[PDB]
DNA sequence: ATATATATATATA
DNA sequence: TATATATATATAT
């Protein structure tokens with residue numbers, strides 16, 4: 001485990017303007033919406049790093065569709081790039097309008113990881129994603145999702161988000177706990193992660209090797225289910241508690257079908273399963289559906305990623321089994337419905353601005369993706385290559 | 398029989414939402430509906446565990462569709478998360494507005510079994526599903542359904558639902574009048590039930606052995622139909638009345654001494670894996686069961702995770718008219734199982750849509766939570782009473 | 793000005 | 806490929 005200070009340090013923040021500017025922008029929003037058909041007063045002003053949520057209290061009779069279907073013209077008349085209308089704030093009566101600022105400060109990855117949520121976290125595969133709309137950091141947990149879609153068009157930060165997730169893995173767990181599998185169909189982005197002991201294979205490029213890696217993941221899932229069936233334990237955390245107590249009790253356990261040890265948590269990232277499905281066919285779709293159907297209790301987790309938010313790629317079989325979605329900036333409302341079963345993803349800004357959809361029944365929480373760069377990535381990868389030796393399992397292909 | 402005191406005790410409920418706190422909400426609802434186009438008057442209030450139905454009488458000359466289009470904004474302006482406008486309360490002249498409570502309240506299973514409906518129930522296979530939208534216990538016999546599909550996404554309260562159904566079997570029925578075939582294609586979930594005398598086998602692992610057990614079940618159904626045709630018997634309950642004509646009333650019979658033919662409830666945890674791995678001959682077996690087996694003595698609790706045409710075709714659709722649907726992720730899946738819409742609107746954690754046989758109208762049922770410790774207690778209470786009476790040649 | 797009807801657009805059996 | 810549903814648009818209110 002390298003220390004957290006090997007990242008780029010925190011710069012000087014400059015936002016959160018004088019309250020006369022916030023009151024002037026509140027009165028400007030009231031005047032512009034009054035010049036349109038609606039009439040609404042600004043309730044409260046919440047500043048933020050990138051955007052500034054204006055909670056406004058709609059008057060009698062005015063609907064929310066009459067606020068959502070003129071956001072284009074409101075963003076034009078407020079001289080900003082694009083505005084976003086929150087249809088529902090949880091537990092209030094108002095309607096959130098989020099306006100970008102003049103200067104747009106980035107999200108610093110050390111400022112994300114310097115949080116007590118990440119620092120005193122319980123699990124072994126956390127995923128620090130970035131701040132909320134006001135600077136409060138979001139740190140999710142991949143063993144609670146248990147799978148993850150990522151989409152959004154180019155120039156929006158998909159590979160930067162995947163690198164933020166993978167450094168969130170690599171700053172906490174040893175290779176005895178979180179052992180990765182990386183399937184990069186290009187040679188472009190995820191090729192930098194070579195050498196670290198957290199891998200199982202060299203970073204898989206060709207699609208026959210991708211299908212072989214998914215079939216080996218199916219085999220690992222089946223042998224872990226058979227082993228936990230023999231030992232009667234429902235989940236992997238209880239299994240590791242059992243085997244740790246058995247090894248510390250002086251009588252370690254045995255082969256159900258030698259000596260067993262603590263199993264790691266396999267995280268299988270995929271960078272473009274659009275192109276993977278394109279080259280191979282429906283067999284990859286059936287394998288991803290099988291893994292997303294069964295592999296929660298066996299520790300196999302997925303980080304999917306795709307450029308195209310279309311029905312050819314994110315099919316219904318993938319949507320029904322993976323309930324946690326990340327939505328970056330997409331092209332239009334049809335792409336937003338394909339990724340989140342609802343609108344609201346097209347109104348973003350890009351360059352690290354996502355809509356985290358939490359697992360289960362939920363409302364999308366706007367998260368700003370942490371900007372992790374090639375300096376930090378290369379430095380932490382060389383740190384792990386100097387702190388450990390590579391270990392590849394040969395028969396995965 | 399095991400005692401009902403094995404379950405966890407009914408904790409004194411956090412009966413929140415005082416009558417002034419709901420009277421103020423009703424006055425606020427009629428004011429915030431009068432601010433929009435409609436005019437309304439609140440008729441009565443039914444406070445409940447999870448969702449609270451506000452029965453409202455609309456004004457003269459206003460339509461339900463105005464309330465339906467106005468629904469999301471009404472849910473926005475009342476400081477709640479969602480709403481659902483029931484277009485028709487059966488038998489009344491009102492419109493049901495169901496506002497979900499912000500306190501998702503757990504339903505303990507002893508709070509469902511202790512109803513007088515369940516204790517005075519006579520059939521061998523009751524299913525304690527949970528409470529209704531109003532909070533009253535809903536007990537539904539399995540013998541009148543006659544089969545039951547279960548579908549819903551991962552983390553919706555499905556294994557807890559199958560555990561509640563099987564404990565509803567086990568808290569009333571002896572090993573004489575009920576006997577379970579547990580087809581568990583996942584190796585992980587329902588191995589906890591191993592040891593009870595209510596099994597015909599150790600709990601089945603492989604789809605090959607599961608298909609062998611289903612062939613055995615087809616053959617047992619066929620010999621039961623042939624013996625009922627020999628005895629001139631019009632259903633299973635008529636043959637248990639012939640059992641009452643037998644040594645139950647102290648007059649023995651012959652073997653054309655016929656004992657009880659136990660009602661078989663075949664649970665399948667994931668038949669999606671089976672019907673995608675081994676093919677469609679299993680679907681031929683399931684269709685030949687599900688078309689005929691009501692008057693036979695073999696029933697199926699089918700559970701899955703793919704409400705799709707790849708799993709649930711039209712073959713296993715028209716023959717199972719009683720379906721449990723948990724939280725699915727699309728209206729397309731809702732039309733795939735319930736043949737209507739409204740299944741993705743569920744609030745998760747066992748809150749299902751019991752679709753009764755006959756009337757094709759959904760009946761929403763909150764799922765009863767049963768923990769794994771209560772399961773170990775019931776497994777212990779059955780292992781301390783009876784050795785496993787197997788027909789071991791099923792595999 | 794705006795709820796309704798309708799022609800067509802995309803997703804699925 | 807035929808169709809069920811969904812979305813944008815005259816239209817008359």
Ligand SMILES: Nc1ncnc2c1ncn2[C@@H]1O[C@H](COP(=O)(O)OP(=O)(O)O)[C@@H](O)[C@H]1O
Nearest residue numbers: 106154155156157158159160351352369370371
């Ligand atoms: N938090 C952020 N702040 C600023 N820029 C960001 C942030 N996150 C991502 N980016 C931008 O996203 C770009 C990477 O996009 P990428 O994921 O490679 O798109 P694709 O993989 O679809 O081609 C980088 O050039 C970077 O400038």
Ligand SMILES: Nc1ncnc2c1ncn2[C@@H]1O[C@H](COP(=O)(O)OP(=O)(O)O)[C@@H](O)[C@H]1O
Nearest residue numbers: 550551552553554555556557746747764765766
């Ligand atoms: N009646 C209930 N009340 C509250 N939570 C419930 C209830 N029934 C089930 N659950 C929740 O559902 C979870 C189990 O889901 P499960 O049936 O295992 O889904 P799956 O089988 O798809 O994994 C449990 O963690 C439990 O908390």
